[PDB]
C-alpha cells in the first residue's frame, strides 16, 4: 500500500503514431501539489508538472507500441501489452498497480483497475501527465519530420483537419493502417 504504482495510457487512438503509457511510483515522503488531473489544465500547466513529477517520483516509466503491432491486435490488445511493458520497465517493483478503466492485464503482481482515476488518483494523473508530455514531444518530432500534415497542431487526432490532410496527401508508414479514413485514402476499404 506504500509502493502503490499507477499507470495510464494516453494517445490510445490517434490516427498516427503509437500509443504511450507510464507508471510513476510516489509515496508520502515528499511534497506534491497541483496534480489533480491533466485533461482540464493548460499545456503550460503540463510542462512544469512533467518535470515536477519526474524529480519527485522515486522512479519514472515509459512504454509504447508499434504501428504494425497495434494494427495486428487492435487498440484493445496492444494498449494493454504496452502498459505491461511499462510496468516491466519500472526500476523498482510496485506492490500495487493502477490502470485507468475496468480492465486488467495478466500480471504477477496484484494489479487492479479503477474507473475515472485521472481525477481522483494523483498517481494515475501524474502518469497520464508524463505519458501525454512524451506524446506531445513525439508528435512535435513527427511534425518537424513531416510538416505537410500539421501533426503538432491537432496531435494526430480524428479532426476534420486531419481527415482532409490524410485525404489529400495520404498515409505514411507511421499511420495506423487499421482505421477507416486511412484505409479509405489508399483504397483498402471494402
Amino acid at each position: 500500500t506504500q509502493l502503490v504504482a499507477g499507470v495510464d495510457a494516453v494517445g490510445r487512438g490517434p490516427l498516427v503514431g503509437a500509443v504511450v503509457t507510464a507508471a510513476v511510483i510516489l509515496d508520502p515522503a515528499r511534497p506534491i501539489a497541483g496534480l489533480n488531473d491533466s485533461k482540464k489544465l493548460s499545456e503550460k500547466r503540463r510542462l512544469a508538472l512533467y518535470e515536477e513529477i519526474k524529480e519527485k517520483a522515486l522512479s519514472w516509466s515509459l512504454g509504447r507500441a508499434e504501428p504494425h503491432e497495434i494494427d495486428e491486435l487492435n487498440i484493445l490488445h496492444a494498449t494493454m501489452l504496452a502498459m505491461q511493458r511499462a510496468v516491466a520497465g519500472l526500476h523498482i517493483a510496485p506492490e500495487y498497480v493502477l490502470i485507468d478503466g475496468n480492465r486488467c492485464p495478466k500480471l504477477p503482481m496484484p494489479a487492479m483497475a479503477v474507473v475515472k482515476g485521472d481525477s481522483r488518483v494523483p498517481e494515475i494523473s501524474a502518469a497520464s501527465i508524463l505519458a501525454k508530455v512524451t506524446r506531445d514531444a513525439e508528435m512535435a518530432a513527427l511534425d518537424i519530420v513531416f510538416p505537410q500534415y500539421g501533426f503538432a497542431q491537432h496531435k494526430g487526432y480524428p479532426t476534420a483537419f486531419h481527415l482532409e490532410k490524410l485525404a489529400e496527401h495520404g498515409a505514411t508508414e507511421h499511420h495506423r493502417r487499421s482505421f477507416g479514413p486511412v484505409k479509405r485514402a489508399l483504397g483498402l476499404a471494402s
Binding site: 500539421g150 503538432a152 497542431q153 491537432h154 483537419f161
Partner: protein
C-alpha cells in the same frame, strides 16, 4: 508571426493577431513597455483643483 503561420485554430489566430498588433504598435511608436509602471507621479496644477 512564425507560429501564427503554423497555428490552425480560429481563437488562437485571433489572440495571436491581437498580440502581434500590440507588439507592432509598440515597435513603431517610441513607447516603452515599462512606461506603464508609474515611478514618477505628476500632480495637477493647484488652480485646476482649487479649495
Amino acid at each position: 508571426r512564425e507560429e501564427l503561420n503554423e497555428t490552425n485554430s480560429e481563437t488562437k489566430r485571433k489572440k495571436l493577431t491581437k498580440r502581434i498588433k500590440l507588439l507592432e504598435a509598440f515597435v513603431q511608436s517610441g513607447n516603452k513597455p515599462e512606461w506603464m509602471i508609474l515611478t514618477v507621479l505628476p500632480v495637477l496644477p493647484p488652480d485646476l483643483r482649487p479649495l
